[PDB]
C-alpha cells in the first residue's frame, strides 16, 4: 500500500529523479498539518459505532425492501453481513485518511468488491447509498469542534469526502 510520501517517491522513481523542492515542500506541508489529520482519524474511529448505526437506520428507513422477506438484508445473517460491510468500509476510509492516499482503498477495500457484490446479487446502488449516508454522518463528527483546538480543516473534510465518494463510485 502507499501513503502520500511513498506515492510521491514512486512517481519520482519513474522519472529516475530525486524528489524536487516543490515535492519536498508539499510533503513538509502534509506532515506539518498532520496533527489535524490525526484528530480527524480519531474522530472517525471513536464515533464509528454511531456512524454505522445512524447510516443503517437511515438506509433501512429509505429502503424498506432491503429488510423485507426477500430483501438482501432480510435474515439476521444478511443484515449482519451488511453491518460488517459498513464497518469495514468506514475502517478503510479512516486508513486512507491517515495515509493521505487512497491506495489502500484501491488495493484492499475495493480490490474486488464490485465483483463480490455482483456475484452475490447485492444491489450496489443501496451499498453506495449506505456509503453516502456514512459520509453524511461522519462529516458531523469530523466537524465537531469540541475537545479540539479550533482551526481550518476544510481540506481534511474534502479529502474524507473524496475517499467516501471513491468507495461509493467503485461499488456502483
Amino acid at each position: 500500500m502507499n501513503d502520500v510520501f511513498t506515492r510521491a517517491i514512486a512517481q519520482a522513481d519513474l522519472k529516475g529523479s530525486f524528489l524536487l523542492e516543490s515535492d519536498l515542500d508539499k510533503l513538509a506541508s502534509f506532515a506539518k498539518e498532520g496533527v489535524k489529520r490525526l484528530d480527524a482519524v480519531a474522530a472517525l474511529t471513536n464515533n464509528a459505532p454511531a456512524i454505522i448505526s445512524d447510516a443503517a437506520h437511515k438506509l433501512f428507513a429509505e429502503q424498506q425492501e432491503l429488510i423485507q422477506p426477500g430483501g438482501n438484508a432480510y435474515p439476521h445473517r444478511r443484515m449482519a453481513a451488511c453491518l460488517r460491510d459498513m464497518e469495514i468500509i468506514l475502517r478503510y476510509v479512516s486508513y486512507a485518511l491517515l495515509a493521505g492516499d487512497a491506495s489502500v482503498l484501491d488495493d484492499r477495500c475495493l480490490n474486488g468488491l464490485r465483483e463480490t457484490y455482483n456475484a452475490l446479487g447485492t444491489p450496489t446502488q443501496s451499498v453506495a447509498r449506505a456509503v453516502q449516508l456514512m459520509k453524511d454522518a461522519a462529516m458531523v463528527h469530523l466537524k465537531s469542534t469540541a475537545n479540539v483546538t479550533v482551526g481550518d480543516c476544510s481540506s481534511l473534510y474534502s479529502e474524507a469526502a473524496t475517499y467516501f465518494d471513491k468507495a461509493a463510485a467503485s461499488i456502483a
Binding site: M1, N2, D3, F5, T6, A8, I9, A12, D13, F18, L19, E21, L24, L27, A28, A31, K32, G34, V35, L38, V41, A42, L44, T45, A48, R91, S94, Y95, L98, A99, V104, R108
Partner: protein, 162 residues
C-alpha cells in the same frame, strides 16, 4: 513501502481493527520527525553530484586494482555504471529519509540484492566503501537530528550489503 504510517495501517488491518491511540502516537512521532528527515533529504539532494563523484573516487582509492584493464572497474561504461549505481543508492536513501522508513531501500535496493550482485560479479565491498564515504560527508553536511536520520538510513544500506 514499509513506513511508520504503512506498518501502522497494515498491523491494524491484519487484525481487522480501527486505528487506536498506540498507532496514532506512532503516526505523531513520524509527523514530528518529518522536519529533520525532509531537510536532511534536501541537503543530500542538493549535493548529489559531489557525493557521487567522491564516492566513485573513494571506491577507486580503496580498490585500486579494479581500475586496471581486464576487470570490473575498467572502461568508461563500467565507471558510468558505478556512478549510476551510487546515484541509485543515494536516491533511495533520500527516498527513505522522506518516507520515514526503510521502505524504499528495502523494496528497491535490498530485495534481490545478493542474487543480482552474485550474478554480475559485483563486490558488496565497493558499495560499502562508497556508502562509508557518503556517511563521512553526510556527517559534515548535516547537523543535529538530520545527521542522525541520514546515518541510520546509510548504515541500514551498509548492513544490507554485509
Amino acid at each position: 513501502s514499509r513506513t511508520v504510517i504503512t506498518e501502522v495501517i497494515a498491523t491494524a488491518d491484519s487484525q481487522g481493527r480501527f486505528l487506536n491511540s498506540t498507532e496514532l502516537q506512532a503516526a505523531f512521532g513520524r509527523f514530528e520527525r518529518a522536519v529533520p528527515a525532509i531537510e536532511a533529504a534536501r541537503a543530500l539532494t542538493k549535493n548529489q553530484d559531489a557525493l557521487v563523484k567522491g564516492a566513485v573516487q573513494a571506491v577507486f582509492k580503496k580498490f585500486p586494482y579494479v581500475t586496471q584493464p581486464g576487470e570490473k572497474g575498467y572502461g568508461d561504461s563500467n565507471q558510468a555504471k558505478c556512478a549510476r549505481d551510487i546515484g541509485y543508492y543515494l536516491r533511495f536513501i533520500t527516498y527513505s529519509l522522506v518516507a520515514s522508513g526503510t521502505g524504499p531501500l528495502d523494496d528497491y535496493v535490498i530485495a534481490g540484492l545478493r542474487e543480482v550482485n552474485r550474478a554480475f560479479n559485483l563486490n558488496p565491498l565497493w558499495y560499502i566503501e562508497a556508502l562509508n564515504y557518503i556517511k563521512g560527508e553526510t556527517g559534515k553536511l548535516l547537523s543535529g537530528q538530520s545527521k542522525t536520520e541520514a546515518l541510520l538510513y546509510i548504515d541500514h544500506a551498509i548492513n544490507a550489503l554485509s
